[PDB]
């Protein structure tokens, strides 16, 4: 299993990211996909999670209304959409798996998180 | 919300005890990630006691109480990396990472 | 205000049955519509209310005990029942006023080696009071001479652990249980 990321990019404060996570190998409708950003020299902090079967989205509490993910079943890929960059939002954007092979749809209390097969990471520059 | 000591220092052959404490962790698993400086993090330790394949049989874990700990027995020279604990909130949403403990 | 029910139902680590976690729910508005849109194995049994009539009510204090038991012992989580889980681990009272919610987790609590993390108190001196919790690992002396701390031989270890392999039968897979018990909380 492996996860493909987009390239390095330099943006302006405004319309910023359609960063892509083209997945492969594993059954795409099984695991969640988490997006994690890291300010250079700072701690990791979690942005959002997407269910590839369209069963729900959830973004971080301090990033609500600014970041929105977009699923695509056909290309086996998932996107972001962030708007209005600041110098705070300069980071490396990591796409990750969930490491939980759920067979029957959702037993209540699955171990979400456990980000295993992290992508190569792409960089936003303001 | 999850709090963590900012750094630890260790000499090889000793025992390093990375700790993570959070108020919303009586009921959530803790997953540890070991990010070397420069590349993407890897899951080094997961579900408070369990070990993914591809890891040497040295990385343990303990969540006796509301304070998860990782313990390295016999630290080598290649374990100089960050160690972020992880959880969720108390439901399962809004996953939170940790302080970013540097091991030297 | 949206009472935390996802904080009890979706919590990943359910405590063992001898040390069931209790979450006080108060000063909010409880939406029970996420408790009858269920996936098809849930066992939403209410004693004193009805599932379609929980919204138009207000309760004083709501308590949500959660634990993990075997499949055939969900029948023990009922008012006025006698077995092992009821007698020594979790006694619901005679006059129960809440709901008992249990779902299959043959996932989530089941290693191929078997998750011995869940323990049930097999031996106790006396039966439990309703909503009593005995967490102590004290050695139960069961015969002639009560000695200091010797393990075994009528001086047994009480908290025998389950074995939860995924190839076990339907009545032995671990069934995660959440027991709602019932003015601040409304609908
Ligand atoms: C338990 O969680 C499931 C999964 O939902 C995820 O985590 C939840 C805490 C919640 O924050 C969701 O946004 C997350 O996606 C919940 O199941 C969802 O329930 C809603 C409404 O009932 C439904 O519209 C969604 O389709 C469900 N998703 C799935 C995968 O079934 C569930 O609501 C939570 N249980 C409780 C007690 O709230």
Author numbering:
A (entry chain A): 2 to 127
B (entry chain B): 3 to 106
C (entry chain R): 334 to 515, 522 to 526
Give the text the authors published on this PDB structure.
Owing to multiple mutations to the spike protein, including in the receptor-binding domain (RBD) and N-terminal domain, Omicron BA.1 infection can result in substantial NAb evasion. We expressed and purified the prefusion-stabilized trimeric ectodomains of BA.1, BA.2, BA.3, BA.2.12.1, BA.2.13 and BA.4/BA.5 spike (S-trimer). We determined the cryo-electron microscopy (cryo-EM) structures of these S-trimers at overall resolutions of 3.1–3.5 Å.
To study how BA.2 subvariants, BA.3 and BA.4/BA.5 could systematically reduce the neutralization efficacy of group E1 antibodies, we solved the cryo-EM structures of two group E1 BA.1-neutralizing antibodies, BD55-3152 and BD55-5840, in complex with BA.1 spike proteins using cryo-EM. Group E1 occupies the S309 binding site, whose epitope involves G339, T345 and R346. Similar to S309, the epitope of group E1 antibodies includes an N-linked glycan on N343. Group E1 antibodies are also generally sensitive to mutation of G339, E340, T345 and especially R346, as indicated by their escaping mutation profiles. The N343 glycan is critically recognized by almost all group E1 NAbs, including S309. Thus, this group of broad and potent NAbs is probably affected by the S371F mutation in a systematic manner through displacement of the N343 glycan.
